[PDB]
């Protein structure tokens, strides 16, 4: 998981989700998994 | 770290 | 002419069902009753407020996320002696303290305010041991 202040879509298959008051970025490619923080 | 004393060692009355 | 000052009178006992009521908004009213500021002969330096009995204190109600976010605090005087206890758990373990702590913080500080707190009888569950005094039911 990447933890950044700038969470972004990295590829077209990336999906910006928001769960529990935190912006995540989930995706098929595990490298693209992001959480804002 | 070593700094200069600001008071002398106390002398007898 | 000088302002009327009341001689000692019999205090009124009062019953209140806390079930479903908002913690702070009930607490305010209980404090007012305790201070006796509903009585037209109110006097600041004597205990002439009511005795307030409260039941179903475990069924007090709270808005927002305060069940898990409201934190009660206690310092022991020792290093690291700060205990933090959430609403949820306070209710689980000593539910009457929730309403007690609220009312206590809304009473004056000092010898008198401490006496007024003593006239607050709070109970979890719908029963109270004060049949003898036969407290007047109040709708607030």
């Amino acid at each position: 998981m990447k933890v950044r202040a700038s969470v972004k879509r990295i590829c077209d298959k990336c999906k910006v989700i928001r769960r529990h008051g935190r912006v995540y970025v989930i995706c098929e490619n595990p490298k693209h998994k992001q959480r804002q923080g | 770290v070593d700094k200069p004393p600001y008071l002398p060692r106390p002398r007898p009355p | 002419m000088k302002t009327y000052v009341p001689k000692q009178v019999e205090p009124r006992w009062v019953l209140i069902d806390a079930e479903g009521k908002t913690l702070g908004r009930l607490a305010t009213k209980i404090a007012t009753l305790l201070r006796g500021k509903h009585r037209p002969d109110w006097t600041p330096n004597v205990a002439m407020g009511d005795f307030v009995v409260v039941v179903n204190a475990d069924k007090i109600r709270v808005t927002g996320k305060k069940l898990e976010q409201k934190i009660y605090t206690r310092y022991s005087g020792y290093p690291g002696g700060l205990k933090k206890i959430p609403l949820e758990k306070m209710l689980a373990t000593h539910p009457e303290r929730v309403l007690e702590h609220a009312v206590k913080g809304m009473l004056p500080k000092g010898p008198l305010g401490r006496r007024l707190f003593k006239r607050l009888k709070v109970y979890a569950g719908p029963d109270h041991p004060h049949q003898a005094q036969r407290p007047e039911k109040l709708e607030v």
Partner: protein, 204 residues
């Protein structure tokens, strides 16, 4: 949970499987139950035990009454065991078989006014190289203006011992029912002749 009152009698070692095993001998039995605490009446569960028999010439009238209501001869010591309710009217050593682990409570030996080195294992001060009358002293006890005070619980000299101590999970090496004797492996708080309490262990 089960337990018995007893006096610590002394220490030895016995031999078992070509091993020397240090023991403390304990005179435990016999303890008559003199009162029972019930959830209906007392709000909890335990048994008041009596130990050692007492010269009735010394038993005052309120005490006399208490014993009489239990049909029990005067006893020297009254003590409860929590969450324990024996079927019989008498608790003896036989409630323990060899191999069980137990917890022993006593009153530790008293060191009186104890220095900070004995009490708390402080290092004290140097014994040469200029040390000035502070060989067994505690050193600093705080900071400066912040916080400008001393913590509650600050380890300092003071009384030490003569206090309740429970050592836990001791092996019962043997029991000698005909002499009301327990043989526990290792050390037990307090002096010889001191009153101890032997409870079934809480360790798993």
């Amino acid at each position: 949970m089960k337990g018995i009152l007893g006096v610590k009698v002394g220490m030895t070692r016995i031999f078992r499987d070509d091993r020397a095993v240090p023991v403390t001998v304990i005179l435990a039995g016999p303890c008559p139950v003199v009162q029972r605490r019930t959830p209906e009446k007392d709000g909890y569960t335990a048994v008041q035990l009596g130990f050692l028999p007492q010269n009735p010439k010394r038993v005052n009238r309120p005490l006399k009454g208490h014993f009489a209501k239990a049909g029990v001869e005067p006893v020297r010591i009254l003590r409860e065991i929590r969450d324990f309710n024996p079927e019989g009217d008498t608790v003896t050593v036989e409630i323990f078989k060899p191999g069980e682990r137990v917890d022993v409570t006593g009153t530790s030996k008293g060191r009186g006014f104890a220095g900070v080195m004995k009490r708390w294992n402080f290092a004290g001060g140097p014994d040469s190289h200029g040390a000035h009358k502070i060989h067994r002293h505690p050193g600093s006890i705080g900071n400066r203006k912040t916080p400008g005070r001393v913590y509650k619980g600050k380890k300092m000299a003071g009384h030490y011992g003569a206090e309740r101590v429970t050592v836990m999970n001791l092996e019962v090496v043997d029991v000698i029912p005909e002499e009301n004797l327990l043989l526990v492996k290792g050390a037990v708080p307090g002096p010889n002749g001191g009153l101890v309490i032997v409870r079934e262990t809480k360790k798993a």
